Ligand binder design. Structure first.
Ligand SMILES: [Ca+2]
Ligand SMILES: [Cl-]
Length: 306
């Protein structure tokens, strides 16, 4: 089977991928995997796929759904990696006595326009029963977002920003920022993606990988304690946070065995992205591009007589 270069993100979510290697599930499926650590995020994962530098990518769902719906016909969503949604925390300055809730927010801080922190602001407003926010502050990175809400020097001030909870929890504990709200993603958090080229020339090997990921997920579910020990010893998370994290996460134990949920992966995500103004194209064209790039079935091997 062709060599597969898998671009992943060094997070607690990548735990099953690690155990699959530890238990040698990959080699068991006759696979030669070359993992490519991508701390930059899902944004770079897509770039690595488009440049043919990697065969497979595992990142946030909304990233791959948006890119496909925006025109990129070289990206394919194969299956769901994490069935449970992502928890976004709404934060502000720890000493912002003027900001006591997510109510009456004006200046919303975001890393980039069209990013997760930006798109989720529309979900926040929707659930709050208030019009979408219009004043966005681009702070580039997470570091600046905290300084912004804290009204520190070097950056423009902002009322609040959104960021993954467990990532923000560290800064709740050190009293650098405070939580004013929490919002779940309407969709499942993580998915498995590939390129048109890798899927066309390396289909069979990709299937075995997904099955290998399936066993890795099974090992995780049957060895939570070992996963906690791994995360709090190799990743940027304490034993406590790693413990609570496992209580909120549900990997797709049916990955490769059952088609992904279209409503919870495509529909809800599409509706949100369009609400955020990320998708300017018509409904028919968007849905058309999603119907051909998002798998409605699991990968299968060709027949012997074929
Ligand atoms: Ca005070
Ligand atoms: Cl196109």
């Amino acid at each position: 089977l062709p060599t597969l270069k898998v671009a992943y993100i060094p997070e607690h979510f990548s735990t099953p991928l690690f155990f699959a290697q530890q238990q040698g599930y990959y080699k068991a499926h006759d696979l030669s995997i070359e993992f490519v650590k991508v701390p930059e995020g899902s944004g770079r994962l897509i770039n690595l796929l488009n440049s043919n530098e990697v065969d497979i990518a595992i990142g946030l769902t909304e990233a791959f759904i948006a890119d496909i719906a925006k025109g990129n016909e070289n990206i394919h969503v194969l299956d769901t990696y994490v069935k449970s949604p992502l928890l976004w925390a709404v934060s502000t300055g720890s000493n912002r006595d003027d900001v006591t809730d997510a109510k009456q927010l004006k200046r919303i801080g975001v890393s980039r326009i069209g990013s997760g922190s930006y798109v989720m602001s529309f979900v926040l407003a929707h659930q709050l029963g208030v019009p979408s926010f219009d004043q966005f502050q681009v702070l580039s990175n997470f570091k600046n977002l905290r300084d912004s809400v804290n009204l520190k020097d070097g950056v423009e001030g902002s009322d609040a920003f959104m960021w993954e909870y467990f990532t923000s929890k560290k800064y709740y504990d050190n009293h650098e920022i405070k939580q004013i709200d929490q919002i779940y993603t309407p969709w499942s958090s993580w998915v498995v993606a590939t390129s048109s080229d890798s899927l066309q020339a390396k289909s069979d090997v990709i299937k075995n990988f997904i099955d290998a990921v399936n066993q890795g997920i099974q090992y995780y579910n049957e060895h939570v304690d070992e996963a906690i020990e791994y995360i709090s010893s190799n990743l940027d998370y304490s034993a406590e946070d790693a413990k609570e994290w496992t209580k909120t996460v549900e990997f797709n134990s049916r990955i490769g065995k059952t088609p992904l949920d279209w409503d919870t992966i495509v529909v809800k995500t599409k509706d949100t992205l369009k609400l955020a103004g990320v998708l300017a194209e018509s409904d028919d064209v968007i849905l058309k591009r999603l119907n051909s790039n998002v798998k409605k079935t699991n990968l299968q091997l060709d027949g012997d007589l074929e």
